[PDB]
Design a protein around this ligand. Structure first.
Ligand SMILES: [Mg+2]
Ligand SMILES: [Mg+2]
Ligand SMILES: [Mg+2]
Ligand SMILES: [Zn+2]
Ligand SMILES: [Zn+2]
Lengths: 146, 160, 177, 87, 97, 99, 39, 94, 38
């Protein structure tokens, strides 16, 4: 990678970089996810993959450098936000209520003071419509709204 | 060298249930032969006691053992104190083993013997119909015939 | 089984003390398995008139987890019946006041709406932390398995699985990161 | 009378000890709790200070009574409704 | 190496089919509890050791609260019942086995 | 009138109780009620819910063998579905034909 | 399992044209066949 | 005598004493009582399953509300087993 | 702010930001362009 220090002299150097694992199983893919056959087989739990795709301080890396396609990039964005909210990344921090699958920012949602009738019920969103299309491994689909 | 189709260990890569390998039919077949032989020699020597059976009779299935009573809801064209053979035995079992038919057990394998010991009537059942504001009201009293059978014996024979 | 009649009946209708953990578990799945055990629906000798419930002891109710945004969207409504008694508190506020109220309310909702419900509620025991009284701890049998699988934060992955997971993308060697 | 006072641990005094009026000091502020003068069963005009009904101008036997106690739509009376009782 | 169910809580189930395939044979001998899995059984100089026979009389309130705490029930089970139900209760009930 | 309609209600409630007790025993053996019932039918075992609940209460070893048989049939069905070809039918999935 | 029974050809209701419904329920203890059932 | 139990027909007093006498006369070591299973214990409705072992081999097990009645029931079950009158025994041939 | 169902950028200096779950038009140079999504 590349690092800059300030001492007033500012200087940048190249540090050691990682490389691919040598033989991808699908070399004809375009995005790294498509190459490594992970098109619908990841969730917000896969912090190994997300830590591969994030910045050291919790932010993300852009598409033109990650090589991801747009759909995969948006899915990784949402997975990373949910992992950050669930607390699965304790070392990628900036500068007690237990959660998981947190879609919205916890400080921006308002309480559902008035649920509607059962035909117009105000539901509580869980998960991601981007992650709607993952492999189910179950005979009932995901329940995106509780 | 990763094989074509290798998916890395993620939470949705593999199915959540454990992989089950079934034993191959050849040694499974000889193992079935050994188990059948062991149960058959247990039958021959007689290492069992107080057999029970699940028996299909009169559109029912009854779980009976020896010295039992059952109350069939119809007359059976049989005098009192008459010994008959219950024949449609779905299950016979004991401590340490159990035989299951598909769906009926062989008649050379298990024999259920019962005895008509009572032919009686049920208590009077009331059938009333009422519909309000329509003057609708009917009353009937029925009494179904009934037959008490005593299950005397359940015998199994070595035929496996 | 050759037991005498009174010990056989006592053994069949005996009462069991199950243990259940909180600690990142959803209150409703905890409530579902707790309510099954409280009604006694797990027994093959179940009948609604046979008083066949069991004791359920749930610990770590202070460390339950809600999926989604239920901590801020879920509202518990009560009414002190004077004019103006309508109170609505979010799940966060209710948890911060009473650390057992959320699991208690979920179990109370999922029990059958009978006169047996409060008897099941007396047999339910809830503790917010690791601490359980000694009498309960000498009564417990069968810590039941937890419904969720604790999705394993990044730092306690060992180096073996970290370098077993492949690197997906090649970084340019000039990028700041 | 025995009355219970909440104290911290540093203000514990041995049981059986005498206490006098010099425990306080002049120029201080205190709180005094007691059972008030009981007045028995009283109506709304003394218990809650309702305005009552006018004396003359046609009124039949209603001068000191509560009027409505609720509305028509509720088929009941709300808890805490001010009604005559013990003062 | 395959077992359809775990073989360490009730019985060692071995399933089999006869040679004609017409009947299924189950062999289920009971499992015993191991010795190492059991637990051992738990274990005035001048006057007579008299009987400590004290029975405090509780009122209805504290007594029902004590019984409720003892048996993990509510109070309504311990509150009494009237003569109508008391005489309605069948005192020679039918009894099977 | 309540007696006459309670005949139908009695039959329905008895079947509901049997399903409850079979579900209890099946989940005690790690299985589910639909899995147990469907795979016993696939094994050609025609015990109804009444005698299945009786076997649950009074013959736990026989019920454990039945649950093992249903689990074995379910694993045979999964193996056949995964294989999708002309692998042998499986020992317990063989159907006894009648003519 | 009505669909499974239809796939195997064994009706759909287990009380339909099978041996479990058409074979006689009982016989005399000596071995004499019973009279035929009314259904 | 069809539907009754041995210690309902023949009344005994010390099943543990009868059991140890029988084991001494059939040269089996003395039965050790152990707490096989236990539920409750500090409550008013406990369950104790006490098992009788011989040479680290289980010969009987019995339930009760107290350890003492559980071990006497285990003694009765052992006596029934080694007296042949068990509940699952072969029924009488009439 | 003014409440709008549809938000429009009335300047080159207006900017759309999504804050507390709702969209906003903020303008540092023409503060009358402040808009809040309903
Ligand atoms: Mg006036
Ligand atoms: Mg007048
Ligand atoms: Mg006047
Ligand atoms: Zn892609
Ligand atoms: Zn502007």
């Amino acid at each position: 990678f590349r690092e800059v220090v300030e001492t007033t002299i500012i200087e940048g150097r190249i540090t050691a970089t990682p490389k691919e694992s040598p033989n991808p199983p699908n070399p004809s893919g375009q995005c790294p996810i498509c190459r490594w056959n992970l098109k619908h087989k990841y969730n917000y739990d896969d912090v190994l993959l997300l830590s591969q795709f994030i910045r050291p301080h919790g932010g993300m890396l852009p598409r033109k450098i990650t090589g991801l396609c747009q759909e995969e990039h948006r899915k990784i964005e949402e997975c990373v936000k949910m992992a950050h909210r669930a607390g699965l990344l304790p070392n990628h921090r900036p500068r007690q209520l237990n959660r998981y699958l947190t879609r919205w920012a916890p400080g921006s949602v308002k309480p559902i003071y008035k649920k509607g009738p059962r035909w117009n019920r105000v539901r509580m969103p869980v998960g991601s419509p981007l992650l709607r299309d993952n492999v189910c491994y179950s005979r009932t689909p995901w329940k995106l709204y509780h | 060298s990763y094989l074509p189709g290798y998916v890395p260990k993620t939470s949705l890569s593999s199915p959540p249930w454990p992989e089950v390998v079934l034993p191959d039919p050849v040694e499974e077949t000889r193992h079935h032969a050994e188990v059948v032989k062991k149960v058959n020699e247990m039958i021959v020597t007689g290492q069992y006691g107080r057999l029970f059976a699940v028996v299909h009779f009169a559109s029912r299935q009854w779980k009976v053992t020896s010295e039992d009573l059952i109350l069939i809801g119809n007359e059976l064209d049989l005098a009192c104190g008459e010994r008959i053979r219950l024949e449609k035995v779905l299950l016979v079992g004991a401590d340490n083993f159990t035989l299951l038919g598909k769906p009926l057990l062989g008649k050379d394998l298990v024999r259920v013997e019962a005895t008509v010991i009572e032919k009686t009537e049920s208590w009077p059942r009331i059938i009333m119909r009422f519909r309000k504001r329509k003057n609708f009201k009917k009353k009937r009293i029925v009494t179904t015939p009934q037959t008490v059978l005593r299950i005397n014996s359940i015998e199994i024979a070595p035929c496996l | 089984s050759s037991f005498s009649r009174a010990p056989q009946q006592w053994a069949t209708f005996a009462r069991i003390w199950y243990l259940l953990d909180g600690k990142m578990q959803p209150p409703g799945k905890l409530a579902a398995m707790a309510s099954i055990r409280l009604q006694g629906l797990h027994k093959p000798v179940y009948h609604a008139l046979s008083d066949c419930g069991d004791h359920v002891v749930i610990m770590n109710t202070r460390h339950i987890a809600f999926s989604g945004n239920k901590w801020e969207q879920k509202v518990y409504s009560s009414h002190t019946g004077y004019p103006g008694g309508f109170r609505q508190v979010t799940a966060a506020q209710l948890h911060l006041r009473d650390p057992v109220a959320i699991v208690k309310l979920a179990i109370y909702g999922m029990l059958p709406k009978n006169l047996h419900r409060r008897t099941m509620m007396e047999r339910l025991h809830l503790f917010p932390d690791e601490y359980i009284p000694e009498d309960i701890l000498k009564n417990l049998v069968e810590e039941l398995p937890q419904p969720r699988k604790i999705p394993k934060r990044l730092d306690e992955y060992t180096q073996e699985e970290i370098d077993a997971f492949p690197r997906l993308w090649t970084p340019p060697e000039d990028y700041r990161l | 009378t025995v009355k219970i006072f909440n104290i911290t641990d540093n203000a514990a005094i041995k049981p059986g000890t005498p206490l006098y009026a010099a425990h306080f000091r002049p120029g201080q502020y205190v709180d005094v709790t007691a059972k008030t003068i009981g007045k028995g069963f009283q109506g709304v005009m003394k218990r809650w200070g309702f305005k009552g009904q006018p004396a003359t101008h046609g009124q039949t036997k209603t001068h000191r009574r509560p009027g409505a106690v609720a509305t028509g739509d509720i088929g009941r009376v709300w808890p805490g409704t001010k009604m005559p009782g013990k003062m | 190496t395959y077992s359809p169910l775990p073989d360490d809580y009730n019985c060692n189930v071995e399933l089999a089919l006869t040679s004609d395939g017409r009947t299924i044979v189950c062999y289920h001998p009971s499992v015993d509890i191991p010795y190492e899995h059991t637990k051992p059984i738990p274990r005035d100089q001048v006057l007579k050791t008299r009987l400590e026979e004290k029975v405090e009389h509780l009122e209805e309130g504290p007594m029902i609260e004590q019984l409720s705490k003892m048996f993990f029930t509510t109070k309504h089970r311990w509150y009494p019942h009237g003569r109508y139900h008391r005489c309605r209760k069948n005192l020679n009930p039918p009894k099977d086995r | 009138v309540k007696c006459t309609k309670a005949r139908y209600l009695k039959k329905k409630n008895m079947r509901t109780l049997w399903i409850n007790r079979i579900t209890a025993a099946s989940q005690e053996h790690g299985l589910k009620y639909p899995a147990l019932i469907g795979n016993l039918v696939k094994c050609q075992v025609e015990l109804n819910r009444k005698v299945l609940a009786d076997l649950a209460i009074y013959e736990p070893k026989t019920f454990k063998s039945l649950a093992a048989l249903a689990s074995r049939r379910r694993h045979e069905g999964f193996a056949a579905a995964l294989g999708d070809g002309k692998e042998p039918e499986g020992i317990f999935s063989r159907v006894v034909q009648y003519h | 399992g009505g669909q499974w029974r239809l796939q195997q050809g064994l009706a759909a209701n287990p009380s339909g044209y099978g041996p479990l419904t058409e074979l006689p329920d009982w016989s005399y203890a000596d071995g004499r066949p019973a009279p035929p059932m009314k259904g | 005598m069809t539907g009754k139990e041995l210690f309902e027909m023949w009344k005994i007093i010390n099943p543990m004493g009868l059991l140890v006498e029988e084991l001494k006369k059939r040269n089996v070591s003395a039965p050790e009582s152990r707490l096989t299973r236990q539920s409750g214990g500090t409550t008013a409705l406990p369950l104790y399953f006490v098992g009788l072992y011989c040479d680290k081999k289980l010969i009987a097990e019995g339930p009760g509300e107290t350890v003492l009645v559980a071990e006497e029931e285990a003694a009765r079950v052992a006596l029934r087993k080694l007296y042949g009158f068990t509940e699952n025994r072969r029924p009488w041939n009439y | 702010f003014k409440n709008k169902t549809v938000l429009k950028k009335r300047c080159k200096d207006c900017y759309l930001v999504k804050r507390r779950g709702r969209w906003y038009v903020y303008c540092k140079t023409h503060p009358r362009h402040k808009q809040r999504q309903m």
